[PDB]
Amino acid sequence: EDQQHKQELHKLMARCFLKLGEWQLNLQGINESTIPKVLQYYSAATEHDRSWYKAWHAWAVMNFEAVLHYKHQNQARDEK
Numbered sequence: 001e002d003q004q005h006k007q008e009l010h011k012l013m014a015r016c017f018l019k020l021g022e023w024q025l026n027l028q029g030i031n032e033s034t035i036p037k038v039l040q041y042y043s044a045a046t047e048h049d050r051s052w053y054k055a056w057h058a059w060a061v062m063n064f065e066a067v068l069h070y071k072h073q074n075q076a077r078d079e080k
Contacts, residue, residue, distance in 0.1 A: 010048035017045035018055055035066040 021038030028034055042059030045052065 008049070011052055014045040014049040014052040014055065017041035017048060018052075018058065022058070030069060032069075035069065038062050039066065 018041065021034065021041040024034060025038065039059060039062060042055045042062055045055045046059055
C-alpha cells in the first residue's frame, strides 16, 4: 500500500546519502576512504532516488574527482 512512505524516504535518504560523504568531504578532508563511501552513498543515493539530480552531477564528478585524486595521487606518484 505504501511505496510513498519509503519512496521519497529514498529521495530523503538520497540527500542523506548525498550529505554524509559530501559532508564527510567537508569533514574528512579527502582520502581513499572517502572515495568508496562517497561513491557508495551517491551510487547508493543514485539508486535511492534515481531521478534526484545533482548526485548525477556529483557522483559522476565525484568518481571523476576520485579519478583526479588518483591522478593527483599519481602526481604523488608520477611525481614520486
